[PDB]
Amino acid sequence: DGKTFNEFSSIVNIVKSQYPDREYELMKDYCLNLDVKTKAARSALEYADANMFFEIEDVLIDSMISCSNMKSKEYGKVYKIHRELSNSVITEFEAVKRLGKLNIKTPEMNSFSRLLLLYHYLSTGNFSPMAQLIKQIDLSEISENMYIRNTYQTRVHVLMSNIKLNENSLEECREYSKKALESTNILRFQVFSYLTIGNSLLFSNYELAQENFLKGLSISVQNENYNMIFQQALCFLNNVWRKENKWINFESDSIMDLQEQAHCFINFNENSKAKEVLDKLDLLVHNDNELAMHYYLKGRLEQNKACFYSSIEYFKKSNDKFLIRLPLLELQKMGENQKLLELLLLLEHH
Amino acid sequence: KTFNEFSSIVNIVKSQYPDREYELMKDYCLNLDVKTKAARSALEYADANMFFEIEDVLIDSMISCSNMKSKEYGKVYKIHRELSNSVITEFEAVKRLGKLNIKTPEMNSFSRLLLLYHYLSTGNFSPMAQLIKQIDLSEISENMYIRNTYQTRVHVLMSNIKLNENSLEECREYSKKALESTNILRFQVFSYLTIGNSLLFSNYELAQENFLKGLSISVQNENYNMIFQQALCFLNNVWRKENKWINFESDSIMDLQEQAHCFINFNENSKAKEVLDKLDLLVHNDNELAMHYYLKGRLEQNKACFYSSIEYFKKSNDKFLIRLPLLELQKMGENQKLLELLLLLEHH
């Protein structure tokens, strides 16, 4: 009793093997009984955060911040900052400021302070500073906690894959997602790895794209949020290839769902229904990448080169080098000059 | 025996013997002990006036002398001279400045200035603004002649940077600051040139008036004479007027481009093609190649050439001259949204 394995993966690996249907129930009861001054408790923290077991995470945090082991206290403090940042309790500026005031000592939290900043960049769609930031992480400095060493490596593979996607560097994108999948048994990371591989194939391989989305759908059947994410991914895939789309949510007023309605109606020369849908979208407040997609759809319904120029403008603003291929193709179909196209490819927004 | 500040001689040579400033200063400067502050000032004096006969003699004697401060000055003015005569590449110049382990704030300032001149002359404008903002003349507190001439240098360069940013009022204000700060003919000349050039697309007569003003104080000097001739030549091609300033006896890129530009302004396309066929076979920096494509786009009426011109103006980060292909594209009915998009995007 109170005896811990030297590496947290042992109890996790057992739980996933022998009792996979009770993983939460078993792990919450185990992690909430750890002495929080211990390496198992510090490992349990990262276990809870990777799976978004917020209920387990919050309790570890509050216990660790108040304990006398400075390592646990520091882990608690910066995971606290990540939860309060990922949920808009605090801004980006005061998180960076709070992180600086910690003078972080451990290599683990030096890595995670950067990961939580990268997650906030992924959240907001702000891809430009992500390359620099993710190059500063050096996980080889983590020598004492191999569980955290390994889980963080999965986190970096998944983020690198997402970065490579937006850079339209798709072979690398798929390499990083495959390294992610080989390295993990955490549902969240498998899910986003299958979603990224499939998205990376959106413009090249319909059947392989679909196959990855369905595999991801298979492992998250009873998670309403992941399930919907894969359905939306499949819906977009079928609109890109201009096929019959049985994934469209017609009972939704989210931007993504309505745009897919319009994209399908446009694909099938249902122009009046399509304008009705874009009528609906004009009364909703769009952000940057949503606007990019909005002008692409308007450019196609009106067959108007101007609206595609607007689409390119907003894709460049968000440093989306992947999805920008959609308006660039339609401009070409309208006979736009080759040199112009290359120029639009080469120039960057900054 | 020397004055503590070099401006004591120059101002007396300028007030009393203005018609023989060169003769008298070539004599005085080459009779200074190269180890002293006056010799270090004479080097800046000679370089700012482009009296290379004084400068290159001081550089030699200062590098082989035993005062370490005079030696450092001489070595980095030598790097300026070799780079500006294409004896060494920019990479070799940067490498050599690093190996010098520069100690004075005067040469920390001038080491950045000579890079700035190289960027200007090579059409590589995007690094200039960051680099110039690193210059801090206040650290120069022992040689006031050098502090004050470097300050004039920074005004003229700031004025040029604003010009290439298409920030034309700010351009003219810095050139005025430069004029008010100097009695050195070289800096007066490039100030009138920059003011005139800032008026190229808006005010023909005031542009020409500044060119003729710079000409009025410098015509006797062949180098300066030619610089205002070329400015007036481009002015009159921009405005598509009869052009009495064309140099038909030159094979420099600048002069050949103005021939082609004039031939195109009139309907003389075969003469223009003859000139451009020659220009094809010359190495261009990015800014020069952008002009080349603009002229090709006008001759061939080919939109892709105009897009290539914009491409190379973006690479050089010239926001002023890019107005030439933009207008031609507007005339060809190009979409306004598209042009605004090209304007807001950048090369990098």
Tab-separated table of C-alpha atoms in Angstrom, chain A residues 296 300 303-305 308-309 312 324-342 344-345:
chain	number	residue	atom	x	y	z
A	296	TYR	CA	-14.943	30.904	-51.826
A	300	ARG	CA	-18.589	29.969	-56.983
A	303	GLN	CA	-18.917	32.846	-60.597
A	304	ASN	CA	-17.103	36.087	-59.775
A	305	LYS	CA	-13.298	36.391	-59.694
A	308	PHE	CA	-12.025	34.502	-54.871
A	309	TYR	CA	-9.520	37.328	-54.371
A	312	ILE	CA	-7.291	34.335	-50.852
A	324	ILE	CA	-6.181	28.247	-50.101
A	325	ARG	CA	-5.878	25.633	-52.862
A	326	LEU	CA	-9.686	25.865	-53.261
A	327	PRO	CA	-9.975	29.484	-54.559
A	328	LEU	CA	-6.679	29.127	-56.475
A	329	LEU	CA	-8.221	26.263	-58.460
A	330	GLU	CA	-11.385	28.195	-59.293
A	331	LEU	CA	-9.366	31.232	-60.388
A	332	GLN	CA	-7.455	28.953	-62.751
A	333	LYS	CA	-10.713	27.537	-64.162
A	334	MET	CA	-11.675	31.137	-64.920
A	335	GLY	CA	-8.425	31.405	-66.898
A	336	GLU	CA	-6.411	33.531	-64.497
A	337	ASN	CA	-2.830	34.173	-65.611
A	338	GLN	CA	-0.266	31.606	-64.535
A	339	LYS	CA	2.261	34.218	-63.375
A	340	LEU	CA	-0.449	35.864	-61.287
A	341	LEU	CA	-1.261	32.585	-59.631
A	342	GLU	CA	2.380	31.959	-58.791
A	344	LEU	CA	-0.410	34.833	-55.156
A	345	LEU	CA	1.266	31.594	-54.057
